[model samples]
Structure formats: structure tokens, C-alpha cells
Target chain A: RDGLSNLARRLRFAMKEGSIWLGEQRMILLHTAALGALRKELVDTLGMERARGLFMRMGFHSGVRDAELAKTMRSGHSDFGMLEMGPCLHTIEGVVRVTPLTVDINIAAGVYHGEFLWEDSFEGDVHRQMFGVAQAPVCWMQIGYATGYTSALMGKTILYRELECVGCGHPHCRILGKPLEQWEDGEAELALYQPD
Target chain B: RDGLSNLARRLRFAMKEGSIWLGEQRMILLHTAALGALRKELVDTLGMERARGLFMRMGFHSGVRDAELAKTMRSGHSDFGMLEMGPCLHTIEGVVRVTPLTVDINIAAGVYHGEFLWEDSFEGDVHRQMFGVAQAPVCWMQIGYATGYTSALMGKTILYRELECVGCGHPHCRILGKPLEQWEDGEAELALYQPD
Candidate 1:
């Protein structure tokens, strides 16, 4: 219902605006709302990729704030070594693995397989996306990936972002209001990756 | 001031909860935040290696919400992408990209450049990152690259994950609200890399 209203509103604007919409290039908000709707289905239905939400991952990742541990989290990629050696991911009873390989995120490629939590938690406790704690460090962790990756691809070195964990209010959450940090090596780290 | 105080309170509580704050993981978000601070000191902060962290960019790829953006602007990357992308971003000036790649997330890697539009009117008033307008062509350009590139990179056709852009939004202002339709395949005109 809420989504439909948004859609209707979008259509009205598009009709009035015409090609100018794309010229304005502002469909991001629209897409976000749709993802929110789909995320609910993913959580409840256990279907498609939306079930694998980045927001929740950000929250959970923040749950374990530590340097070495964070490195371990980055190692899900079969290409890279296993996580820096931290708690197991399978404990969730879900087959967790960070497939190493730059994910193809072009419009030509298909969309990502994850859910949205811009507003509230969608899936069950553990599986939910970033909800009210949007700005939380965990949220930055996720947004870091978006902006950093995009900029990197476009020929720049701008990655990483953190968020505060809105004091773990989850009935099962273990994190709370904490500083938002990113896994980084600072300047030395940046220089190391310089056009080598 | 409010943020700093809130952060102090949260940090104190985070310490009490017996949670682990991964500096490295925090580095990801911190690095992102620092870049901005870095930029303030000197317009172009956030280096290339930082770009590697682009994919799975924490902030929603399309754009998030105003309230969400507030989270980012207020606490800054302090909370996460949701908190920031809205207020800080949503402009017509800078260009934020995410290139989720081991080397260059062209095919196997997910790399996309996202730019905001404060007012292109003075300069044609238009924008174009990876997205294309509706009912038009040139939108679904990354699909083939994803399949062929990944398969080529790996010694096999690795069906990592059938991804999709689950959500999208405009963090800043004016162009708030959601989309009216889903950008499906077939509708887009395919795009590709530079010629060999």
C-alpha cells in the first residue's frame, strides 16, 4: 500500500517530467522503497537473495568490533585466506561465505541478492537488514562498501565507512551504541595499493 | 557536541556490554569517514586501495532516505551510511563510486560509480552514472560482463550469486520518495567495456 503510493507518485512526476527524470537521475529513492518491500518477502518467505541482507551483516559485524576480527570477516573470499581467524560464520546455521571476486554491479549485470532495512528490520532477528539504527557504525560499514567500491571503480581511492550500533536493542542482539569504525591500515594501506 | 556526547555514552555502554570492537572492521567505516575529514582538509581524500572496499558498499547503492541521511550527517559516518548518505550526499557536485573488485570489479567484481545532482541546470542539469531512464536502452550492460568476466577470471564459470539492485533512493532532498517500476532485463540497452 505504502509502496503503491510511492509508485503512483513517481509515475505522476515522471509523466509530468518526461525524460527529464533520468536526466535528473534520481530514481534511487524509488528503488530503495521497492527493495524494502521485497526484503520483507525475502525474510518471511526464505526466498531469493534479499534474504542475504547487507544491513544485517553490518549490524552483526559491528557486534564483534575488533581489528584482527574484522580482517577475519573480510576473508570469506575463497580467493583470499579464510577470515583473519575469528568466530565461525556457520554458527548461524546458515552457509556463510564471503565469495572473493569483485561482484559485477553494472546495470547490465543482474541486481544484488540482498534485502533492504533503510527503515526497519525486515527478516527475523539475525537475518534482518539495517533498520532504525541506520546511521549506526554498522550502517557506515555497508555504505562504505557502496560509495568506496563505486569510487574505486571510477578511478579513485575512496572506500570505508562506519556506523554506531544503536545500542543493541534486539532481543538477541549483542551490540549497542558504539563507535563506527572501518577495517583500514590508514595511509600506509592506501599507498600499498597505489597502482602496483 | 550532541553527537560527541551521545558517542561517549554509547561507547561507555558498548564497553560494558562486553562486545569486541574490531579496529580493522571499524577501519572500513573509519577510513571512509576519515576520507571526508581528509577531503575537508584537501578536497580529494579517500585513496584507491580504499576503493577496494567499494562493493557491498554499506550505504544503499541507489540512495537511501532523508532521515537515514541525517543519521550519517549528524553522527557522520559515526553511525553508518544510512546516517550519512542522505544529508552529506544528494548533491550535484562530487562523485562517489564503488568498485567491488579484487583488482578491477568489471566482470567478476562489482564496480559502479554513483554521482549526485544538486543542480545541473547551470550546466545542462543532467546526471548519468550506471542507471538509465525507464523504457530506454543501455541499462542492462553489466550482465554479460559479469558472466564472461568472472568465468574468465576464475578458471571456470562461477555462479557466485544471482544478484540484483534490491533497493535505491536519494539521500538528500527534492527527489525523495521511491520508484514506480522495477528496472528488469530486456528493457535495458546493453553496454560494454572499451574495445579490444
Candidate 2:
């Protein structure tokens, strides 16, 4: 793992030297509490499902862009190293820490499966503490991140689903990703990410 | 009748380049409904006085930033020309159509008074329809702009208060500003703009 030093360097550059950009998408830091407020108000206005879709799409856009950066940054590295940058980039953005458990990929067959253990999920912590718990996993954005990155990497749409969340009484958060047809409910989940 | 050519030019730059900056501040435009949602939620959670203070401060920051830009953009313009940019900027930002009815200024005496008619006031239209009418003028941010621009121009703090608002059943809006001590109650209005 390269850790976050590289990302931290650029974040510092953005703050002090006056600019840090990701492929023309300039980044800005916002307080976590402010994000929490945004989630709360969105849920209040549009209910949980719509808010989840909005947040998830927000993350997906970032993930797709990060995938672009990953491939460009390590063009010489093998696909394994480049693909692993998905989680690395996720951690760099200060959203959560990822301890990847498994990543099985087959470019020839267009099949890829990913499993990750998430620690300190911002949404998980906020949902449990600030919004109380939900019956199902609430890390919509993180799932979106996985899906977005995997899709960009494979050159085919990917769908990720969160199987467990601390916000829903799971001991730890876990996420799974595969091609859309791999899951029974992927039909429904895929619709959420579709262009409206 | 200038329509928002100056603001339109700046807006186009932001759109083309993907971002705009005013010194340290970056600007983005959001839909009016989004602002309406923000105003409603702030009033609900922070209460009207605190919400008013927040919106006023938000516009005040813009007013101050514009003052800085004025110096760089056309230093030779008359103070009247510079002051008139306030309305142009406001209209360009989609805040309202302004018909300036009166502007009396005495730099030697540190006095200023202004009255304007507002059509399509973003706040007035949103509040009167969504959040209901208020007993007092509800154009807090617009009032803040008047106070802010006047204070910046006069080299002394001036306070502006709204005399009427469409949010309070007035057919149109009218605002007045003067030196901090001009009106018997001007001191009280000045207190509303203080940093919390």
C-alpha cells in the first residue's frame, strides 16, 4: 500500500500553493459536520432513498475521475497495482479507510469481484450517531465509489452493493462488487445509478 | 436596463473554465429553489434572527469582495458608477431586477440614503410562496448588500434597513441606507450586521 502521503502532498499544495486539481475538477475541503447537515436536510426533504441516490452519484463521479488518475499515475505498474488504487484513492479523500480483502479479476471473461472491509466510514459513523440506524446498509456513496471505479477499470458497467454496515448493527462494514448481472437484486440497484 | 451584461460576462468565464475565483473566494451558482430550501431550513433550525444574520453576512461578504474587484477592474470610474455595479452584479447573479429610484450620498458628512424597487426578488418570491409572509421585511441579504456596499464606499460603516418587502405583502420592495447614526433606530439595525 502506498498510503496517503501522495494524496496528502497534493492536498497541501491545493491549500497552501493555491491549487490542487484532479483532471480539471478542483477539490475543496468541507467540514464533516457540514456534510452531516447536508445528509440530514436531504433526507428531511426527499426521504432516505432519494438522498442516498444523490450522495451515491456524488461519490461515483469522484470515483470515476480517480480511476482516470490511477491509471495515468501508474501506467508502468501491472493491472493489479493500478486497480488497487481504487481503495487507496478512497482513503486519500478522507472518506474512509479500506482494508481490501479480496479482488478477483478476469479481463478475458469480463468478470471481476471485489470485497473490502471498511473502517471509519463517514456515512456509517454519521448514520449511527447523528441519524440513528437504518434497517439496511447506508453507505450508498461508498458502494457508488466501488462501482464507479470498477466500471471504469473494466470498461464495462459494474454494480457494487454493501452487504453490511455499522449503521445497521453490523460489527464492521463490508462491500461487494461485481458485474451487474452477478447479483439477484442488481436490476433494482443498477437503476439507481442510471441517468435520470 | 443594462440587463446583467457584466455579471453575464463573468458567469460565462466561470462556465467555460469550470470555476471562478474572487481573490480567495470561489463562486458557484445554484438554482433558486436550492437557495429557498437553504433559507427555509436555516430559519427552521437557526430561527429567523440567526438566519437573517447568516444570509446578511453571506451577501456582505460578496459586497466586500466586489469592492475589491471594483478597484482592479476600473479604478477611474466615478464612485456612482462603482456603486451602480452593485445592482448590476445582483441582477447578473439572478437575485432581482432593480430599479434604482434614489441615491443621495454626502461623503463629507458620511451619509448615504438609497431606495430601490425590486421585481422578481429571489427571496421575496420564494418566501411569500413557500415559507409564508413575514411581518417585517424579509430581504435580509439584499439589505445586507446595501449596507455593505455603502460602508465600503463611504469609508465608514453604514446600516441599511428594508422599509418594505413583497414577503410582507408589499407590492414591491424598498430599502434605505444611511450613516450608522442617521435614523433614530439606525443603531439597532447596525447591531444586526455584527459578527456573531
Candidate 3:
């Protein structure tokens, strides 16, 4: 409520009403091992791409909700203030530490182009343990977060395409995002989110 | 809110505030095939006995949570209402259709004995398709729920176990429950809910 200076207070164990809440949604703390179990089940049953979609959608929906909360919580603030909430919330939620390498966006004008670095990704940790060095970026949920948060904020479809990941033997994970029609390979990224 | 008369109304799609809440917990509908996938992964990763433990624990925790909600929803309700809520919730959640053949309980004295028939069991359906009808009763989650709910209601540890299951070639599924000390097989049933 006090702007970026008070953002550190975002991660609370319990509220005054006395339970976890992420906005109005009740939140539960689940171990990464449990999430890993679910990931393995998805990969085994639906294979890689489809499993990716499931994780992506989960993150996507969460981001969509977070975006609404951002608007509600920072209605009178600047767009710059509201947008930074995504990375802050992402890190505080223990998903990953996100670093914005570039962001050139006008939310009202429906155009976005951005690149980001992801560190300490839980999804990457699970992937590396299960499959060794991944042949490609393995942070499905992080990618989804970037896309969904941006899309909801901009009111236009945005797709984040991962270019590198720690699980894939890269030094770190990196993703680039843009409006759907901007990238030559946008169709490939969009196809991943479609129902199988 | 209107007692058993409005029980069907409790299964609302979206609450008055427009948020989806099932009973008191945030609910999400999942495809049964996804459950089948989890079952396969559990068996493959942990083997038969340990996998059964995993499913049983899942049901056990769910039953415990439901028991808490049962008390909160109807504070002045009878023990009969509290116990019957288990089967009703189970069916409403699309887990199974349960028929009570008998129930003998003394809540104040910490005693419970019950027998029930299970029809259209999800676990049984998955088992029959995957393993082609087992040689033993295999309704892990159903059995776990009966034990977990009864234990929570009576404020003592109880165990319910499958006496027969369609997955094991019985015409229908049946289960019996009682305090842990009352049965010789209590150790075996209790062991299934513990960590290996």
C-alpha cells in the first residue's frame, strides 16, 4: 500500500482473519516435492508438450487473477508502479526471482515487447532432477506468468517464449515476450497453450 | 444454509460474490483421466503398497478437512448428521455413490462400527481398466475416507477397510469401520496410511 518501499511486506504467513490469502483466494503452502510428484504424473501421462500446457495454464490463470489484484490495489498509482507488482509478487510467491532485461510496452495501446531472466526456478529444479540437462527451456510456469500477466495488463494476447533455461544447460533462464503478431515464431508459442 | 433441505443448493457454481467456492474450500474440477494418471505414476514410482499409502493419505486428509467443515456448517447437528455427511460429500464430489447397510456408533464412548456399499467407485473404475480386476480389494481412497472421517468424528483413531470390491470381482463394494483396537487387521490398515 505504501509503494515499492513497503513491497517487502507482501509475503505474509497469515492475515488478520488468520489464514493464507492471495488477494481473495485462499492459499496453501505445498512442498516442492508434492509439486514434483504432480509434474512427473503429467509428463508420464500427457508427454512433454501437453504437460507444459497444464503448468502454463495454472500459472497463466494465477497471473490473470494477480493482475486484477494489481489494478485494484494500485488503482491511483502510475502504470510503472502497477507493472512492477508482477515481478515482486512472482518472487514473493517463491516461484522464481525475475529480472527484467527489457520492457517496452504501452498497456493501453496493446503493444508489448519484453525479455526477462529467471533465477531459482522451482520448475527448473524439478526438471533437472528428473530429466538431466533439458534440451530446451523448462520453466513452463514462469513463461506462463510473464505472458498471462502481460496479456491481462495490456488487454491483448501476449505470449512469452523461453529461449534458454538452467535445466537446458544455459547459464540462466531467459524468455522474450511480444504481441502475438510481432514474432515470426509466435504461432509455435501460441500452439503450446492450445487445448490438445 | 437451509439445512438438509437446501443441501443441493450448496453445490453452487459461483457464489453470490461471483467467486467459486465449494463448501468452504476453493474447488477446481479435474478430469478423472488426470486422476488415473496420478494413480499410474504412484504405482510406477512407489510400487503397490506404498502407492496405496499415498492414495489413502490423500483421502485421509480430505476426509479430515471435510469433517472440520461438517462441524462448522451445522454446529448443532446430530452425530448421525456428521457421519452421513461423509458419503453425501463423497457422492456430490463425484467420487462414489455410497449406501449405508448399517451404522453402530457411540460418539461419547468413542466407539463406531459401520458397513456400507460403494457403487460407481472412481478408484475401482481405474483399477479394473488398468489391472483387469485385481485378486484383492483395491478401493484405496474409499477405504481411507471411511477411516479418516470416522476417526475425526469420534475424536479417536478408527480404521475402515474394504471387505469386498468390484475391482476384486465382488458384485459390489463393501467396507466396515471401527476403532483401531477393535480389529485384528487394524495394524495392516493403519500401516497403509503411514510413511514408508
Give, for candidate 3 chain A, the lowest lDDT window spanning 10 residues.
A11-20
DockQ of the candidate models in sequence: 0.02, 0.04, 0.04
Error of 2 at A2 (Å): 2.4
Predicted structure with the largest lDDT when compared to the true one: 3
List model 1 lDDT by residue over B1-196, tens digit each.
Answer: 2332232222110211212111111101122122222122211222322211121121222232223223333434332232222222222112121222222223223332222222221111111221222121111211222222233333233222222221122221111111112223312211111111
On residues A85-164, what C-alpha lDDT tens digit does candidate 3 reach at each position?
77766765566767778778777777677888887676787688767788778888778777778788889888888788
Q: Please state the error at residue B101 of candidate 3 in Å.
A: 1.4
For all predicted structures, in order, the TM-scores are 0.21, 0.52, 0.54
Residue A8 CA error for candidate 3 (Å)? Answer: 40
lDDT of 3 by residue, B1-196 (tens): 1233334345443322212234664343332443554466557555788678766776776677666667776656677767877776666555676777888877898768899988777778777776788887888877777777788888999898888899998888888888889889777767877654
TM-score of model 2 (first chain only): 0.90
Best to worst by lDDT, what's the order? 3, 2, 1
i-RMS of candidate 2: 12.8
- Candidate with maximal TM-score: 3
Per-candidate Cα lDDT values, in order, are 0.24, 0.66, 0.68
